[PDB]
Each structure stands twice: as C-alpha cells, then as structure tokens.
Amino acid sequence: AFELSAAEREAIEHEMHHYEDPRAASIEALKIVQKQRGWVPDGAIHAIADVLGIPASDVEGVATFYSQIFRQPVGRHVIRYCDSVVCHINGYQGIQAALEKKLNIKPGQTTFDGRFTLLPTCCLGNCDKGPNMMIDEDTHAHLTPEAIPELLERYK
Amino acid sequence: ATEAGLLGKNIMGTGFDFELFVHTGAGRYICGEETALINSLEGRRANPRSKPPFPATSGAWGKPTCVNNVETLCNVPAILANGVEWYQNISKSKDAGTKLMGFSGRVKNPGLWELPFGTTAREILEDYAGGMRDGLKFKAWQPGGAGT
Amino acid sequence: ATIHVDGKEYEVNGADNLLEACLSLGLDIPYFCWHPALGSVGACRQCAVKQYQNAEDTRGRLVMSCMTPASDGTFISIDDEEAKQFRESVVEWLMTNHPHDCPVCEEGGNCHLQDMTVMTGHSFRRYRFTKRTHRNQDLGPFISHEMNRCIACYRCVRYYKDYADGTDLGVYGAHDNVYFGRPEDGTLESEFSGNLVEICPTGVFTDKTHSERYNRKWDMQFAPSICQQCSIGCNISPGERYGELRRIENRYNGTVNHYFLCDRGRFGYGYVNLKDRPRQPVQRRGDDFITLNAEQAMQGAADILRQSKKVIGIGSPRASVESNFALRELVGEENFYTGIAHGEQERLQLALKVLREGGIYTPALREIESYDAVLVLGEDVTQTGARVALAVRQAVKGKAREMAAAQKVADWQIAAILNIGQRAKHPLFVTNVDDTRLDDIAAWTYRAPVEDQARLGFAIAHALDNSAPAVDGIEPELQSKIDVIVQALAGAKKPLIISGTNAGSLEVIQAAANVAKALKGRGADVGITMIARSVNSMGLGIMGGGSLEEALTELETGRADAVVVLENDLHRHASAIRVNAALAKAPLVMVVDHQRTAIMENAHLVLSAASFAESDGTVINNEGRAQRFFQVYDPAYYDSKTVMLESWRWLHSLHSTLLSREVDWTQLDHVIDAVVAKIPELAGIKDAAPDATFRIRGQKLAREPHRYSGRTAMRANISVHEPRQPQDIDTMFTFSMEGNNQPTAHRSQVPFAWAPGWNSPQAWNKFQDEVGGKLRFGDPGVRLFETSENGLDYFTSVPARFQPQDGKWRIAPYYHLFGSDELSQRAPVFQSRMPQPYIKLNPADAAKLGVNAGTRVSFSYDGNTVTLPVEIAEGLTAGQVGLPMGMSGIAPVLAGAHLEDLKEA
Ligand SMILES: Cc1cc2nc3c(=O)[nH]c(=O)nc-3n(C[C@H](O)[C@H](O)[C@H](O)COP(=O)(O)O)c2cc1C
Ligand code: SF4
Ligand code: SF4
Ligand code: SF4
Ligand code: FES
Ligand code: FES
Ligand SMILES: [Ca+2]
C-alpha cells in the first residue's frame, strides 16, 4: 500500500506547472519519491502515473531507463565510484578494491547493515582531479586507497 | 536575475518575456544527444529521433526548439558585448573564437585553459599541462573525449 | 516517381518510403521494425540498401529503405555487397542472444525472424559468448510471453500504444536489457491485444489458445471465412488439424479489417471444439434418444411435417443467408419468423432503412479511419463492434496526420507525425449509459439514459438544421456541450455518425439519422455507421419476417403444431418461461443447430447442423456487404459416424422430402441462385464469391499448404487404407494441397498467405497490389445496396426525458466483448476472461436501498427472481440498474426493460 505524502504530491504538482505537458514531470516525480524514500517502490509507479495522468507503463519505462532512479532498495548512502577512462588511467581499480575490502560487498550490492550501496557510475565530469567517487550528494576527488576507510567513516 | 528584472516578465522594459528553468537529469549518457535530450525533457525514455525534421522546426512538444551547448551560449554574450569584429580577430584560424581546451591523465598539471583555436596539442601538453608525469613516457592521446 | 533498383527502372509512388515501394514491386528487402499499418521508425536497421545520387556514382552509402523516400531519380542497390554484408551482420547481431528454441517455439514455420535469417544467408555462428536471458510474465489467458526470443524491434509497443491506444504494455530497461511487456503480471487489457501474435515477428507473444493444441502452419487446413462473433464481418483464416479448429488468423481484407482483428474474434472460436456438440441427428421417443443417419432423419421429419396442419419456421441472425432462406422456403414466406424480438426487429429494420434509404453513405471499416469528427450515439462500440472502435481511434489520430502533412513531413515518418501532433486529435463525442473505453480519446462523453442520449442527438440535429424537430427542456450546461458538438461537427469536412441496435432504443437510431440528415443538408461529406448485434443480423433484416413473439403466440394458440428452429436458442430474444411453455405445447419441435442449446430438451428432432467451420454460406455485415465464408474441413473425415451438414442442406433436403418424398442434398450455388431469384434485395450475394466451377488455370484453390504432412499416417490408427480426400462440390476450394495458392493467382478469396521465403504473416505483402493496400485483384465481398438518391424525412418523435419512478428500475445495457456474444461466451477460454456477474447501481440508489458494494440483491423479471452482487457505478444515472447483456440468464432483450421488487436478499 503506497500513498504519496502531501509534500511529495505538492512537489510533483509544482513541477507539473513548469512544462506544457504533465508527462514532462515524470523524471522529477520519480526523483522526488526517491529523495524522500531512498528509492522508488513498486506502488510509487502507479501513484506517480495517477498524479501525472500518464500510464504506469510509461512511468516504469522511464524509471527503468534511467540509472539514477533506483527501482530496488538501496542503503542509507550510495557510493558511486567513476569507472570511466580517465579515472581508469588514474587508477580507479585500487579505489574499487579498497571500497570492496572495507565494505565486504561487490558493486551493485548493499552492506548487511543497510549503510552503504556500492555502485559504479559513468564519468562524473571531474577527470582532471581523478579518480573520483560520489557519496550521496558529495563528490570526492584525488582518491587514494588509504583515504577510503577514513573518508567512508564520516557517513553514518 | 529574476529579482533584478533580468528574467521573467518585461525584461529591461522591452516587453520580452522569458522563463528559465533547470531540469536535473537522472543519469544516462544518451540524454546529451539533442533529440534524446528533447525526449528526456518531455518525460520519456531518452531515445534519439530521426532527422529530418530537425528540432528547429518540430522539437520539444512539436514546437520550434534550439539545443545548444553550455559553452556555445557562454560564447554569445561576449560576441554581443564586444562585437563581431573582435570575435573574428581572436585568432587567425578557420574556427573563430576561443575554446576551452585541456589535457588530462597522468600529466603534471591536468586541467582546463581557454585557448584560441589552432594552438597545437603539444602546446597544451607541455606548456599548460606540464608534460607527462615523472617516469612516464607518452604513448597516445585522445583529442576530444572518449568518442574520438 | 521513377527509381532505379540494381540497374532496373521502376515506377513507384513518390509519397512512399523505399522499403514499401520495393516490396510492392516484388523485391525482397529484409525488415523487422517497419509495419505497413505502423509506419517507419528505423529501429532494427535490417532494411539497409546502398544509395547512389547519380547513375555515375559507384561509392554509394548505406541507408534505411524504410526511412528513405522513394522520390524521383534515386538509385539504390539491394544486392550490393556492402548492403548484403550489413544485413547479414544485423541478423547475426540479433542471433547472438537468441535462444535455441525453434523446436519448442510456437512461431516456428511461421516466424519472420526465421525467414529473415534464411533470407540474408546467415547460417554460420561465430559468436561464442553468453546469451542474455529474461524472465517471463503472465499476460492472461490469450497471450503467452517469452522474452528470450525478443529482437527489440519495438513493433509490439508501437502497435499496442500508438495504434491501439493501449496503456498496459511498454518497454523497460536499457541497452541490451530492454524488456517488452507489462509493468507487472496481469491480463492485457486491450480489446485488440491478440494482434500482437501476428505483429511480433518472433515467438515472444504467441497465441496461448492455439498453444494448448499446437500444430505448425504447414500442417494446418485453412479456409477463407468470416468472423461470426459480431456484425462487423472481419475476414478470418480459420485453420484446423485432426478435426478440431486450431487457430483463427487474420485474413487480410484491405476494405474491411486489413491486418487486425479484435480479441473476441481471435480467441472466441472455442465453441466449435466443444465435445457436447450434436454430431448426428437425434430423434426423441419418449425418454429414449435414437441416433439416425441423414436419410432416416429426413424421411421421418418429412412424414411428421406432412401430417402437420401448419409448420412455422424460426430463423436466427446467427445463421447464414442460405440457411434462413432454406427455412423460409421449407415453411413458406408467411409462416417464416425471424428469431429476434419485436423491438429488436423494429430497431434492426430502422437501421437498415437508414442505411439503404437515408441517402447517406455508409463507410466500410477501413474507410472509417479517414473521417474528421466522430459522434457515437448509444452504441458501446468497443464491446459490440470493437474493430470499429479501433478504426475510430485511427480517425481520431487523423488530426496529427494533417498537421504533420502541413509541415511537409512524409506520411510514413510516424514518430515525427506523433511529435508534431502531441495531444491534438479530431473531435470524438460518445454517449452511453455509463463510461466507455473510448473516453480516453473522446472530446466529450455523455453518460445518460437512452432517452436522454436520443434527446441530445435530436438537439444536435436541431442546432445543425432548424427544420429538424426541436427538443425543449435542455439545461444551459447541456446546451453549451451541445453547441460544442455542433461547432465540431459543422466544421468537419468528413463527419461520421455511429449508432446501432445495441442501445435498445429506436429513438437513438432516429436521432442519429436526424443528425446525419442535418449534416448532409449542409453539404457535408457525412457518413453513417450502424452496428448490429450478430453476424447476419442485417441479412435477416433484409430477408424479413415476423417477430419471435408472433411465432410464440402462433404456437401458443395452437394454430401451429410444428416449429422448425434454426440456429436459435430462443432464450436470448424472449422469456424462457414463455418459450418453454410454447415449445412444450407444440407436438413437433425440430431444432437445426450446431450447439447444445437448452431448447433441445423438448425438441422431438435435433438436426446436427454445421458451424461456420464446417459449412459454407453468406453473411451480411453491418454495412451491407455480402461476404462468403467457406468450409474449413470435413467433419466426417475422421469420425465416419458424424452426420453434420450445412443448415441449408438439411432444410433443402427436408423440403424436397416433404414435397416429392425424395432426398436432395443439393449444391451451394443452387441455393444461392434460389435466394437471388426469390429475394431481389439479396441479389448481390451471387457476386460475393465465384461459384464452384471457378478455376485458376484449370485447378482449384488449395485449402492447405503444399508441405502438408502426415497424409498416410494421420488416419492410420482408424484404418491403414487411406480414403479419398473429401470432395467439395459446394465451392471452388479443394480439401487438399492439390490446388492453387499463388499470390499472383487471379482471385479474391485467399485462404492463407504463403510465399517462398516468406512463411510469416508478412507473406500477405505478396498478395496485395501495394503493401498495406488492397488485395491485388480486389478485396472479396460486395455491397448489397448503393447510397440512395433521396434521403428520409426528419423523425419528429422526440422522446421525453427519463424520469425515475419508485419501485421501477430501468435496465441499462452493459455489453462485454468477452461475454455478450452467445457462441463465443460458450468457449472455455472466455470463462476466465469473462467478468463475474453483477448489477450496477448508482450510489444514491444503493444508499436508498441500504445496499453496499458486493451485497447480493434479488429482482424478479417475468417470473424469474434472480440474485446478483452489487457493483457501484458512479456514472450510471439514478433510476437505472446496469445489467450485463447476453450472459447466463440475462437476455439482451432486457435492454431498456423495467425491473420490479429490487431488494437486498
Ligand atoms: C551520444 C551523444 C551524446 C551527446 N552528449 C552531449 C552532451 O552531453 N552535451 C552536449 O552539449 N552535446 C552532446 N552531444 C552533441 C549534441 O547532440 C548536440 O550536438 C549538442 O548538444 C548541441 O549542439 P551545439 O554544439 O551546436 O551546441 C551528444 C551527442 C551524442 C551523439
Ligand atoms: S522466435 Fe523464431 S527464430 Fe526464435 S526460437 Fe521462435 S521460431 Fe526460432
Ligand atoms: S516482443 Fe516482439 S514485437 Fe516486441 S520488440 Fe520484441 S520482437 Fe519486436
Ligand atoms: S470486430 Fe466483430 S467481426 Fe471483427 S473480429 Fe471482433 S467479433 Fe469478429
Ligand atoms: S573519467 Fe572519471 S570523472 Fe571523468
Ligand atoms: S525496417 Fe527499416 S530499420 Fe527496421
Ligand atoms: Ca460444403
């Protein structure tokens, strides 16, 4: 049983005002639900579709198209390490190995206490300061495998 | 800019109305392709579209639409302020104006510098990027991103 | 436009793309994502050809032929080396993940992907890595889902969402993990979901009803036939194997249904395979039932009929023209009765009078898609005439088509057309007792009683033309909506008015005729469509006869002591108590039918008639087109004890045995000539198909593919001696593969599409003049009547507004595509799809009765106190109860009737 909160519904309608078609608010409606609840659960697809007046199949096609809209439950903090070409040259593999050793999980997995979800991501547009990674809204550059356990500890 | 009359209704008393919005993405590389950008702005899956028709005649929601890069739109105000003749005489090359160029990846000074068109890649690599790092020999380079 | 293909000059349409132009010329270009009805999108990249700007150009460039206009002066090569290598590479890329599934795949031998793999010449696998896999979904009882076989051609979503306006199918995921299906498990809710099995070029979407008793396409015995499940008359290709009807495929008719059926026609055929069907004539002696052969049945029935003082006949709209005529000849014209009720007959003859005397052209089903504004009055088209609802959706998309044509966008560039149009569409106004499935695209929906819908129509006609009679007592809000409808219809270049007999009111048909007349008087190109109930309702109305009530009172007064009932259960058109009493009073009841009906418990003789799969005949659809259906198989080929004949054959031999004491089994063309000699209004049924002497260069038309298998084994358990193939003296088709099915054969009746290299439904390309157009020697079927020179007068009988009165409940008809048709609701696959029985109530009326949603209420109609659970209907107007017509115990004659003693029990 999914119900959109008042804050979620008002945010979705306010974003509906920004376009000439309410369908154009589907991505940000999914992002609003994800920001409130960590991810987009299954009933949120039908709730968002009902608010925007578009089919649930379109909402789910959007949600499963875009990589940053999570349709599976994640941890409290999403680590997104860049695995693209410049960070590969700058040695993201050591960063990924350090993250895997500290968290004892694989990419795409969530730690057993629900704290961290480790994810590869495409280039973060910070290639001159690589290797880069992204915790929830914070980007960390100039990464070394030694600074990974200290820098992960400030996200509780 | 909205507070100081530069955006919104009756900008500078000219009668021109302009609303500027920011649409934050949800993380796909294909969304940068202009027709897939238009599809993503419409709240759909970001597949590109066949051209013709180009977005200039039927783009976002079927309306005339122009998609331009950040740096292109950042180039236009200096053209409008300092004139066309200043912009043509920035460099003696077929490509007018200045381009943000740079070198990245195990160089001494990886970064980003505004340079006229026609500067050599060796000038960017050695004078600006500082050359390769110590103990590393130059093997290859990609000029313009991962797709070159 | 002149194009050059591989150094050969061709004359093509410049408004077409290169793929459809080259396929219309007989050239072979492989393709997946393009469809003639869906336009071009350029997804699969299979249709690559090399293009040259000049004749003196040798480099060229690979282009998509589906995305390239066939303009004047283009040079292309299909057989270029780079083009062939690229098309083979596209097939190979599709093969990298494709499962090793062809032996256990229902698409095998009918698969477009198999055909294009062979056509490109790709037969060697060098990919050595893993293949991606997908889980499947449960899509309901009709469509089986297997996503491993998907080639991501996007045809399913383009058809289902853009064409059919369905909402519950979509594409999910990303790069090589794209998934096509529903957002979750559940039944596909579109009434036209079944066309996915032919639209999908692979075995992802397959016919589950056929999959239960699966056979390959080469093993099938096909015939051209007409769907019997409603009045639209969509052309079908039924196919059988081992004596059972295995599958209903779409038979392409470029004038009626082209590529698409509805799900009632596609999946409601299962009543043909019921094990309780009569296979032999059976005579009742006391409590005993004795099986007779054909001659003893004819002799005994003729003896009892000779002893009888008056024999009356009761026809049916289920039966063909020839069967109803044969009954009419057996009993006499003055003793013939149509099997429908008096009100149903009045509405049907009024609809026929409007069609062939109103002076307004009635369009064919394909022509509906070209109209500019649609007004549907009373007729719940999606549940009663579903393919008309699909065609109306296309007509509504016509506005985006017009806007895109204004911007010089080609008509096959469907994505650009849809982008330009956005949400703009042509006006659609629908009226019903409740909400319709057309309300998503309707400009306005009027939920009102049938009298109020008729009054709205009369007001529309009066505002269009002041000579039309006025209706007083219209609210200003309803007046504003009326002016909206009037401004839409008056500005339309081609308005269309749809009505029919299913609303159960004469005044709705009269109001639709008044609106059409008012639009015609303004010099508009107005069309009118009437939706009838059954497959041959219009033919029965043209033939005419007394109502079922007159036959019942003739049997009840004792003036008739013998009744012959043809293909009629009699409970759908009259109260079962009255029918049972009248049939028990009659000393002789003969029932000629192919289904085990309830009136055979009192029948003294039951003649095992053939269904449409085992019979030939002619049916008249809702627009007056006579269409011939042909027998699919001989039911006595396996079971020699089966005596199952055409109804007209039974009744003609009965008349012969009654007159000259001798049996005459006759021929179909003799009966057709008798029809056109006796009834001049049915004279067009002679030209519906050529007679049985028609040949293609001396050879008959084959019913089964040339690779039909098992001839010396399929009957070998019965007897090791192979019999003769059953003979077809009735038609030009042969019950074997020893015949003609060439795509260039000069004929109109095509039993199935097959061409060398094209085993899928894409083989219909070779049978058309141009792809997506007409069959290349004309579509089968002929219109019985032309548009009359003069129209009718305005109907001045404007009804008063609906008034609720206490203790009296007006029955609002609720039709269901799965359930409201008698024979298809007998099919076992429809039982899961059929809704649970219910009674619809307004919230105010349910609160007044002290009744919540789900509680059972009991009501009495004609001595039948039945109980039904309550569903709350917001849109139903108070003073009405909604009833599902045509279900078990709810006859469609109850539409517009009243109800007493509705209480919670
Ligand atoms: C796959 C793909 C991704 C692209 N991503 C971007 C992008 O992220 N940003 C961008 O400005 N252009 C991107 N482009 C180029 C655009 O299609 C288009 O040329 C540009 O956005 C606007 O043109 P302009 O350079 O004249 O401003 C991409 C093109 C392709 C084919
Ligand atoms: S979809 Fe076609 S190619 Fe694939 S397994 Fe089925 S028959 Fe074979
Ligand atoms: S399911 Fe069928 S129609 Fe849909 S994309 Fe896949 S192969 Fe094409
Ligand atoms: S619309 Fe009517 S005639 Fe056509 S397939 Fe459906 S039930 Fe059959
Ligand atoms: S390559 Fe990693 S931030 Fe760009
Ligand atoms: S048929 Fe042309 S690209 Fe698919
Ligand atoms: Ca026959």
PDB file of N, CA and C in Angstrom, chain B residues 103-146:
ATOM      1  N   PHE B 103      44.203  19.064 -21.071  1.00  0.00           N
ATOM      2  CA  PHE B 103      44.781  17.731 -21.101  1.00  0.00           C
ATOM      3  C   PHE B 103      44.583  17.085 -19.742  1.00  0.00           C
ATOM      4  N   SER B 104      44.232  15.805 -19.749  1.00  0.00           N
ATOM      5  CA  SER B 104      44.002  15.074 -18.514  1.00  0.00           C
ATOM      6  C   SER B 104      44.668  13.709 -18.585  1.00  0.00           C
ATOM      7  N   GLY B 105      45.032  13.193 -17.418  1.00  0.00           N
ATOM      8  CA  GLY B 105      45.512  11.833 -17.283  1.00  0.00           C
ATOM      9  C   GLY B 105      47.012  11.708 -17.136  1.00  0.00           C
ATOM     10  N   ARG B 106      47.471  11.610 -15.885  1.00  0.00           N
ATOM     11  CA  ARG B 106      48.872  11.365 -15.524  1.00  0.00           C
ATOM     12  C   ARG B 106      49.828  12.388 -16.128  1.00  0.00           C
ATOM     13  N   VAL B 107      49.361  13.613 -16.319  1.00  0.00           N
ATOM     14  CA  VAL B 107      50.221  14.712 -16.679  1.00  0.00           C
ATOM     15  C   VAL B 107      50.549  15.480 -15.407  1.00  0.00           C
ATOM     16  N   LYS B 108      51.538  16.370 -15.492  1.00  0.00           N
ATOM     17  CA  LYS B 108      51.976  17.101 -14.308  1.00  0.00           C
ATOM     18  C   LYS B 108      50.897  18.053 -13.808  1.00  0.00           C
ATOM     19  N   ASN B 109      50.202  18.725 -14.719  1.00  0.00           N
ATOM     20  CA  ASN B 109      49.175  19.705 -14.370  1.00  0.00           C
ATOM     21  C   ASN B 109      47.923  19.443 -15.196  1.00  0.00           C
ATOM     22  N   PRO B 110      47.118  18.448 -14.822  1.00  0.00           N
ATOM     23  CA  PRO B 110      45.868  18.211 -15.552  1.00  0.00           C
ATOM     24  C   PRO B 110      44.872  19.325 -15.273  1.00  0.00           C
ATOM     25  N   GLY B 111      44.221  19.801 -16.325  1.00  0.00           N
ATOM     26  CA  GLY B 111      43.345  20.936 -16.147  1.00  0.00           C
ATOM     27  C   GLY B 111      42.670  21.452 -17.394  1.00  0.00           C
ATOM     28  N   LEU B 112      42.378  22.748 -17.395  1.00  0.00           N
ATOM     29  CA  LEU B 112      41.428  23.334 -18.330  1.00  0.00           C
ATOM     30  C   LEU B 112      41.782  24.796 -18.533  1.00  0.00           C
ATOM     31  N   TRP B 113      42.082  25.170 -19.771  1.00  0.00           N
ATOM     32  CA  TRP B 113      42.524  26.513 -20.107  1.00  0.00           C
ATOM     33  C   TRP B 113      41.797  26.993 -21.349  1.00  0.00           C
ATOM     34  N   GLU B 114      41.474  28.279 -21.375  1.00  0.00           N
ATOM     35  CA  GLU B 114      40.821  28.888 -22.522  1.00  0.00           C
ATOM     36  C   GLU B 114      41.877  29.333 -23.523  1.00  0.00           C
ATOM     37  N   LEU B 115      41.852  28.745 -24.713  1.00  0.00           N
ATOM     38  CA  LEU B 115      42.871  28.976 -25.719  1.00  0.00           C
ATOM     39  C   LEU B 115      42.216  29.282 -27.054  1.00  0.00           C
ATOM     40  N   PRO B 116      42.868  30.063 -27.910  1.00  0.00           N
ATOM     41  CA  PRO B 116      42.344  30.251 -29.264  1.00  0.00           C
ATOM     42  C   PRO B 116      42.422  28.963 -30.061  1.00  0.00           C
ATOM     43  N   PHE B 117      41.539  28.843 -31.046  1.00  0.00           N
ATOM     44  CA  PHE B 117      41.595  27.705 -31.950  1.00  0.00           C
ATOM     45  C   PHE B 117      42.888  27.746 -32.752  1.00  0.00           C
ATOM     46  N   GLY B 118      43.485  26.581 -32.957  1.00  0.00           N
ATOM     47  CA  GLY B 118      44.706  26.480 -33.719  1.00  0.00           C
ATOM     48  C   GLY B 118      45.965  26.305 -32.902  1.00  0.00           C
ATOM     49  N   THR B 119      45.888  26.390 -31.578  1.00  0.00           N
ATOM     50  CA  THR B 119      47.049  26.057 -30.769  1.00  0.00           C
ATOM     51  C   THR B 119      47.292  24.556 -30.832  1.00  0.00           C
ATOM     52  N   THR B 120      48.559  24.173 -30.924  1.00  0.00           N
ATOM     53  CA  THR B 120      48.884  22.770 -31.101  1.00  0.00           C
ATOM     54  C   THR B 120      48.652  21.996 -29.810  1.00  0.00           C
ATOM     55  N   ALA B 121      48.457  20.687 -29.963  1.00  0.00           N
ATOM     56  CA  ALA B 121      48.267  19.828 -28.802  1.00  0.00           C
ATOM     57  C   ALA B 121      49.536  19.708 -27.976  1.00  0.00           C
ATOM     58  N   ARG B 122      50.703  19.863 -28.605  1.00  0.00           N
ATOM     59  CA  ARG B 122      51.946  19.877 -27.849  1.00  0.00           C
ATOM     60  C   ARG B 122      52.057  21.122 -26.982  1.00  0.00           C
ATOM     61  N   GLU B 123      51.510  22.249 -27.439  1.00  0.00           N
ATOM     62  CA  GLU B 123      51.493  23.449 -26.610  1.00  0.00           C
ATOM     63  C   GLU B 123      50.633  23.251 -25.370  1.00  0.00           C
ATOM     64  N   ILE B 124      49.501  22.562 -25.510  1.00  0.00           N
ATOM     65  CA  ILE B 124      48.661  22.282 -24.352  1.00  0.00           C
ATOM     66  C   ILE B 124      49.334  21.270 -23.437  1.00  0.00           C
ATOM     67  N   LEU B 125      49.978  20.256 -24.018  1.00  0.00           N
ATOM     68  CA  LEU B 125      50.536  19.167 -23.223  1.00  0.00           C
ATOM     69  C   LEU B 125      51.751  19.613 -22.420  1.00  0.00           C
ATOM     70  N   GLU B 126      52.653  20.385 -23.025  1.00  0.00           N
ATOM     71  CA  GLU B 126      53.888  20.735 -22.334  1.00  0.00           C
ATOM     72  C   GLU B 126      53.813  22.080 -21.619  1.00  0.00           C
ATOM     73  N   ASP B 127      53.326  23.125 -22.291  1.00  0.00           N
ATOM     74  CA  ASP B 127      53.325  24.446 -21.668  1.00  0.00           C
ATOM     75  C   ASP B 127      52.247  24.562 -20.599  1.00  0.00           C
ATOM     76  N   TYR B 128      51.064  24.013 -20.855  1.00  0.00           N
ATOM     77  CA  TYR B 128      49.941  24.154 -19.939  1.00  0.00           C
ATOM     78  C   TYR B 128      49.782  22.954 -19.018  1.00  0.00           C
ATOM     79  N   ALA B 129      49.768  21.744 -19.571  1.00  0.00           N
ATOM     80  CA  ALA B 129      49.620  20.554 -18.747  1.00  0.00           C
ATOM     81  C   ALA B 129      50.922  20.121 -18.092  1.00  0.00           C
ATOM     82  N   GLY B 130      52.043  20.744 -18.441  1.00  0.00           N
ATOM     83  CA  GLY B 130      53.306  20.449 -17.803  1.00  0.00           C
ATOM     84  C   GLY B 130      54.017  19.222 -18.315  1.00  0.00           C
ATOM     85  N   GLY B 131      53.518  18.596 -19.371  1.00  0.00           N
ATOM     86  CA  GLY B 131      54.103  17.366 -19.855  1.00  0.00           C
ATOM     87  C   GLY B 131      53.645  16.175 -19.045  1.00  0.00           C
ATOM     88  N   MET B 132      54.179  15.016 -19.411  1.00  0.00           N
ATOM     89  CA  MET B 132      53.849  13.791 -18.707  1.00  0.00           C
ATOM     90  C   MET B 132      54.493  13.796 -17.324  1.00  0.00           C
ATOM     91  N   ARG B 133      53.951  12.974 -16.432  1.00  0.00           N
ATOM     92  CA  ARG B 133      54.494  12.892 -15.087  1.00  0.00           C
ATOM     93  C   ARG B 133      55.842  12.173 -15.102  1.00  0.00           C
ATOM     94  N   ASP B 134      56.547  12.255 -13.977  1.00  0.00           N
ATOM     95  CA  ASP B 134      57.906  11.735 -13.900  1.00  0.00           C
ATOM     96  C   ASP B 134      57.911  10.213 -13.968  1.00  0.00           C
ATOM     97  N   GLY B 135      58.766   9.670 -14.828  1.00  0.00           N
ATOM     98  CA  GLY B 135      58.839   8.240 -15.022  1.00  0.00           C
ATOM     99  C   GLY B 135      57.823   7.670 -15.982  1.00  0.00           C
ATOM    100  N   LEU B 136      57.046   8.512 -16.656  1.00  0.00           N
ATOM    101  CA  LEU B 136      56.028   8.067 -17.595  1.00  0.00           C
ATOM    102  C   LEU B 136      56.352   8.608 -18.976  1.00  0.00           C
ATOM    103  N   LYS B 137      56.281   7.742 -19.978  1.00  0.00           N
ATOM    104  CA  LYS B 137      56.534   8.116 -21.359  1.00  0.00           C
ATOM    105  C   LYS B 137      55.215   8.243 -22.103  1.00  0.00           C
ATOM    106  N   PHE B 138      55.127   9.246 -22.969  1.00  0.00           N
ATOM    107  CA  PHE B 138      53.916   9.469 -23.744  1.00  0.00           C
ATOM    108  C   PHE B 138      53.727   8.357 -24.768  1.00  0.00           C
ATOM    109  N   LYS B 139      52.540   7.755 -24.776  1.00  0.00           N
ATOM    110  CA  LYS B 139      52.201   6.721 -25.744  1.00  0.00           C
ATOM    111  C   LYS B 139      51.159   7.176 -26.753  1.00  0.00           C
ATOM    112  N   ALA B 140      50.024   7.694 -26.294  1.00  0.00           N
ATOM    113  CA  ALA B 140      48.964   8.096 -27.209  1.00  0.00           C
ATOM    114  C   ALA B 140      48.159   9.222 -26.580  1.00  0.00           C
ATOM    115  N   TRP B 141      47.192   9.733 -27.333  1.00  0.00           N
ATOM    116  CA  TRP B 141      46.278  10.723 -26.788  1.00  0.00           C
ATOM    117  C   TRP B 141      44.973  10.690 -27.561  1.00  0.00           C
ATOM    118  N   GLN B 142      43.900  11.021 -26.856  1.00  0.00           N
ATOM    119  CA  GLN B 142      42.586  11.207 -27.444  1.00  0.00           C
ATOM    120  C   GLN B 142      42.290  12.695 -27.472  1.00  0.00           C
ATOM    121  N   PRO B 143      41.964  13.288 -28.623  1.00  0.00           N
ATOM    122  CA  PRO B 143      41.851  14.754 -28.673  1.00  0.00           C
ATOM    123  C   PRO B 143      40.604  15.307 -28.014  1.00  0.00           C
ATOM    124  N   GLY B 144      39.453  14.675 -28.204  1.00  0.00           N
ATOM    125  CA  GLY B 144      38.210  15.309 -27.825  1.00  0.00           C
ATOM    126  C   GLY B 144      37.206  14.479 -27.064  1.00  0.00           C
ATOM    127  N   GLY B 145      37.668  13.647 -26.154  1.00  0.00           N
ATOM    128  CA  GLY B 145      36.778  12.841 -25.348  1.00  0.00           C
ATOM    129  C   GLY B 145      36.834  11.379 -25.745  1.00  0.00           C
ATOM    130  N   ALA B 146      36.010  10.600 -25.046  1.00  0.00           N
ATOM    131  CA  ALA B 146      36.024   9.151 -25.173  1.00  0.00           C
ATOM    132  C   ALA B 146      35.570   8.665 -26.540  1.00  0.00           C
TER     133      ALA B 146
END
